Amino acid sequence: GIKSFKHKGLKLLFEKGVTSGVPAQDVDRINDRLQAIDTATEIGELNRQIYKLHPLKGDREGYWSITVRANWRITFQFINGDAYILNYEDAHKLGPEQK
Template sequence: MTHNFKHRGLKRFFSDGDAGRLPSDMIDRIEAILTRLSASETIQEMDMYSYHLHELKGNRKGTWSVTVRANWRITFRFQDGYARDMDFEDYH
């Protein structure tokens, strides 16, 4: 599978299991989201109620967002069956 990351901490966690650059109280949720993203072949497979999946608007059109906790989101683009440009951010 080919995934790419904007957030260095997400990349290290996904590839090496190193959670040092991510908030420790969100690790379980981040792991569940990344596992689901990795297994999903369509955006519809990410549409779970608890994830609050939605497409961003304006200059971020084409970027999707799922909720980790409070204002924190994992954002990504979905292309050719893979999540691309994955980021961990508070864009509010």
């Protein structure tokens, strides 16, 4: 299950169904991906082709990234069947050394 959030907008959506903290056009895709992350027992179960699942690097080693739309990513740590530090991030703000 999802145990924690860094991004308040994601948290608000996941917990309350309130969409004000994410882009409105991304709500359905974000709900689907959060549900997938919340259900997964193993990181490998999130490896649907369209998610483009990949681990991050450097200071972000230990985090994972899946695609929502274009450059937007849901990122998280995944350990012992749970997900932590859920965030919604722009991939272009990552340096080459971090991906």
